[PDB]
Amino acid sequence: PPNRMVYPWPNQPLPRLTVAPTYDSAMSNWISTTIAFFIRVVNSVNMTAT
Amino acid sequence: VNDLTRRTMTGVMTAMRQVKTMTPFYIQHMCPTELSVLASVTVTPPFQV
């Protein structure tokens, strides 16, 4: 629809006061879970044997 | 045998068991065909028991 754009990630309006790093954004969540999974992989039995 | 080495030995043996080689498949499925064809080519036919 005219004057609209789509965006692969969730989005928010521009913040009001100063910015700062946060940890509840979609990307941050994606990062944390991904790392958590691979850590689980590394500790799996398949790695331990070798 | 010191366990560190003992740990190493079982490790390297495990690695060998995990290699995704193609040979076992070839033996079971493809090698027989090659023999069956070549049997008609050699100057001496196969002689088996």
UniProtKB/Swiss-Prot annotation, chain A:
It is found in: Virion. Signal peptide: none annotated. It comes from the Viruses. Transmembrane segments: none annotated. Inner capsid protein that self-assembles to form an icosahedral capsid with a T=2 symmetry, which consists of 120 copies of VP2, with channels at each of its five-fold vertices. This capsid constitutes the innermost concentric layer of the viral mature particle. Belongs to the turreted BTV-fold inner capsid family. Homodecamer; each decamer is made up of two conformers of VP2, called VP2A and VP2B. 12 homodecamers assemble to form an icosahedral capsid. Interacts with VP6. This is Inner capsid protein VP3. It comes from Aquareovirus C (isolate Golden shiner/USA/GSRV/1977) (AQRV-C). The lineage of its organism: Viruses, Riboviria, Orthornavirae, Duplornaviricota, Resentoviricetes. The gene is S3. The chain holds residues 671 to 720 of 1214 of the full protein.
